[model samples]
Target: MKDPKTLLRVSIIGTTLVALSSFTPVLVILLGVVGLSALTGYLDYVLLPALAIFIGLTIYAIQRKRQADASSTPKFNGVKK
Candidate 1:
């Protein structure tokens, strides 16, 4: 999403999902059903990197938004007109 807040929220959700799947058996059953049981062994590789990427993106979005806000603030020189 374009909105940094929304982007951060989505990233958090996705990271959370991947984190959960990494530790839980839910994904095992789901993947097994699709005949992709072989992927279970590699979930750590996928989940860890995905989580790192999402976290990095979230940080980037937050920093970018803060920079935008700072740049948008009206600056004043403290001199009387």
Candidate 2:
């Protein structure tokens, strides 16, 4: 597991990337493909899925961090698991 500080940094970077994505959607898509292809050689149509995963992970990270802070959950934990 990463330290809270490191996780915070990663969370920020992910958020910044997502926020900056609106500036140039096409450019972001192109770079995402290149980076994804370089990391994993299967480029057969993984860009959209990968981008969704990226945003999901970023949201999860931030939510997890928030959960770590002093807060309380309802006894029933209203939301689904």
Candidate 3:
């Protein structure tokens, strides 16, 4: 909870589960309402880009967190100063 890495890990897991759960119902509803053909079109035009953006942002956040953690740690060169 207090650590950035822990927070990020939880956030990623929770968001991924929520996104997947949300998508399932939407997909089912779309298929029922719009048919398979239209669903495919919508997936191509909408879901794909949204997924890509979410993945990209998640990656960026993970990298940024790692960099911050690294910078906050002390480094040693094996020499007395």
lDDT of 1 by residue, 1-81 (tens): 765645555554566567545545544544554455355656545545445545655655664474354345533111111
Candidate with maximal lDDT: 2
Q: lDDT tens digits, residues 1-81, model 3?
A: 755645555654576567546545644554454455464655455544445545656655765474454445533211212
Alpha-carbon runs more than 4 Å astray in model 1: 1-44, 76-81
lDDT of 2: 0.57
- For every model shown, what is its TM-score relative to the native structure? 0.29, 0.28, 0.29
Ranking by lDDT: 2, 3, 1
Root-mean-square deviation of candidate 2: 12.1
Estimate the overall C-alpha local distance difference test score of candidate 1.
0.49
lDDT of 2 at 40: 73
Off by over 4 Å in 3: 1-47, 76-81
RMSD of each candidate relative to the true structure? 12.4, 12.1, 10.1
Clashes in model 3: which pairs?
Answer: none
In candidate 3 the C-alpha lDDT for residue 30 amounts to: 45
What does candidate 1 score on TM? Answer: 0.29
